[PDB]
Amino acid sequence: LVXLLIXL
């Protein structure tokens, strides 16, 4: 969702 945070 945000780069590699929270999935993509």
Residue numbers in the entry: 1 to 8
Can you list sentences taken from the study reporting this PDB entry?
We use computational design coupled with experimental characterization to systematically investigate the design principles for macrocycle membrane permeability and oral bioavailability. We designed 184 6–12 residue macrocycles with a wide range of predicted structures containing noncanonical backbone modifications and experimentally determined structures of 35; 29 are very close to the computational models. With such control, we show that membrane permeability can be systematically achieved by ensuring all amide (NH) groups are engaged in internal hydrogen bonding interactions. The ability to robustly design membrane-permeable and orally bioavailable peptides with high structural accuracy should contribute to the next generation of designed macrocycle therapeutics.
We first tested the ability of our design pipeline to control both macrocycle structure and membrane permeability on 6–8 residue macrocycles spanning a diversity of structures and N-methylation patterns. In some cases, two peaks were observed with the expected MW; in such cases we experimentally tested the two peaks separately and refer to these as p1 and p2 in the design names. To evaluate the accuracy of the design method, we determined X-ray crystal structures for two 7 residue designs and fifteen 8 residue designs. The structures for two 7 residue and twelve of the 8 residue macrocycles were very close to the computational design models (backbone atom RMSD < 1.2 Å). Having found that the macrocycles fold as designed, we next investigated their membrane permeabilities using transwell permeability assays. Eight 6-mers, five 7-mers, and sixteen 8-mers had apparent permeabilities (Papp) greater than 1 × 10−7 cm/s. In our 6–8 residue permeable designs, the number of N-methylated amino acids ranges between 0 and 3.
